[PDB]
Amino acid sequence: PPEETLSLWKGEQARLKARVVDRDTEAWQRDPSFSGLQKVGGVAVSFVKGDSVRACASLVVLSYPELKVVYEDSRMVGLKAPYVSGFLAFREVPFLVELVQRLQEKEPDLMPQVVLVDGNGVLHQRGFGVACHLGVLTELPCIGVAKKLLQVDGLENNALHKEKIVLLQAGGDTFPLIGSSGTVLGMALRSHDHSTKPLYVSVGHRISLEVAVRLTHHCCRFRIPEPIRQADIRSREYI
């Protein structure tokens, strides 16, 4: 009953968006060296077309500060119709929740304290990206780490944007992503000395933007934050 389904999802999008928290809720987040942080998660998803859409997803957990994989669960499943633009997350995210639930059941001591999501946070067409959606359904702190600048609220990959990227001279350097509204939606981060291409970081849930950006940088042994890099490898394996 697709009209019923999409209508339900539209209501849920509004309700879930209102649940997004953009401040820190954990003691470890307020410590300058993130004292108390031991486990960082990574999530990545790739889709495949077919009679049914398939999703290849990976949840990994890494030790922190060491960034070594301590848990992994990577899967390919079919997702159920209806497939509606702007609402694929309403099939995708419950599958990701299932991964988290399986971790809680099978290895509860390895539950991540924060999840780095390969995808968008509040820097999103409707201010409710996959990282927000996963966060509110699990109550886990989540960060949206995007590889491209999302064109919302007047953000443009224009000449000035490109100039600001050049002026990111070293790993850790940032510049704010500020909408036409004047709202700070996220930060561009040069994640590593080796790469000149920035990551675009925004809050998913239960973390502040400053903390999200600093933690993201600290997870970058290479350009892509290690939990995402590891999840990416495993969700391309299934592709």
Side-chain angles (χ1 to χ4, degrees):
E3 31 146 8
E4 180 189 359
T5 297
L6 177 59
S7 177
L8 295 179
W9 287 345
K10 286 173 162 183
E12 281 297 279
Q13 185 183 54
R15 183 181 74 87
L16 292 180
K17 180 176 171 183
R19 286 164 75 100
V20 173
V21 166
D22 62 358
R23 63 188 302 185
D24 295 297
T25 59
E26 313 302 312
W28 67 260
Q29 294 169 324
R30 309 199 187 84
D31 187 85
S33 57
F34 301 133
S35 298
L37 178 64
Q38 302 184 314
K39 290 165 291 160
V40 174
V43 164
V45 182
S46 288
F47 301 104
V48 194
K49 67 181 168 179
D51 302 322
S52 153
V53 172
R54 288 181 290 173
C56 299
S58 176
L59 168 62
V60 299
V61 182
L62 283 59
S63 50
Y64 183 92
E66 299 93 357
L67 304 172
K68 290 295 175 161
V69 175
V70 296
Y71 177 87
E72 60 182 276
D73 182 1
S74 308
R75 314 193 194 172
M76 172 168 73
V77 300
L79 300 178
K80 300 282 266 308
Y83 311 124
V84 183
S85 296
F87 296 92
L88 198 57
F90 286 81
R91 291 304 201 207
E92 172 197 10
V93 176
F95 178 46
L96 294 180
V97 172
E98 175 177 356
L99 303 190
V100 176
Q101 291 172 338
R102 190 262 186 193
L103 170 54
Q104 166 71 29
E105 177 181 336
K106 302 298 189 181
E107 293 285 345
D109 290 317
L110 301 181
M111 280 290 314
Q113 292 165 275
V114 54
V115 183
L116 278 62
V117 176
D118 188 350
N120 309 308
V122 297
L123 208 185
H124 179 258
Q125 290 92 333
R126 313 240 102 73
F128 190 65
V130 172
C132 301
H133 198 155
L134 177 66
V136 297
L137 296 184
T138 61
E139 281 295 275
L140 294 166
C142 287
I143 298 168
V145 183
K147 293 163 173 161
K148 309 195 56 164
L149 176 67
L150 223 268
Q151 310 165 283
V152 292
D153 194 7
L155 295 168
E156 312 193 10
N157 185 19
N158 55 26
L160 180 59
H161 186 77
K162 291 176 178 69
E163 177 193 299
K164 290 165 158 177
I165 290 174
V166 181
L167 298 180
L168 299 174
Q169 294 222 272
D173 289 356
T174 60
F175 68 84
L177 307 170
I178 299 184
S180 293
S181 54
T183 309
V184 186
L185 301 171
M187 201 103 67
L189 166 71
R190 178 165 181 172
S191 61
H192 195 276
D193 290 316
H194 183 84
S195 182
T196 55
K197 296 194 299 291
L199 305 174
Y200 296 96
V201 174
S202 62
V203 165
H205 187 45
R206 283 223 206 184
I207 195 163
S208 67
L209 180 55
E210 187 247 64
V211 172
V213 170
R214 289 214 324 122
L215 177 59
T216 297
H217 177 220
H218 279 75
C219 288
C220 287
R221 177 168 290 141
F222 305 99
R223 175 193 173 226
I224 301 297
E226 195 66 5
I228 287 165
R229 194 178 76 87
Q230 292 297 326
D232 282 347
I233 287 168
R234 290 165 172 80
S235 58
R236 293 173 209 259
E237 277 179 23
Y238 275 95
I239 289 295

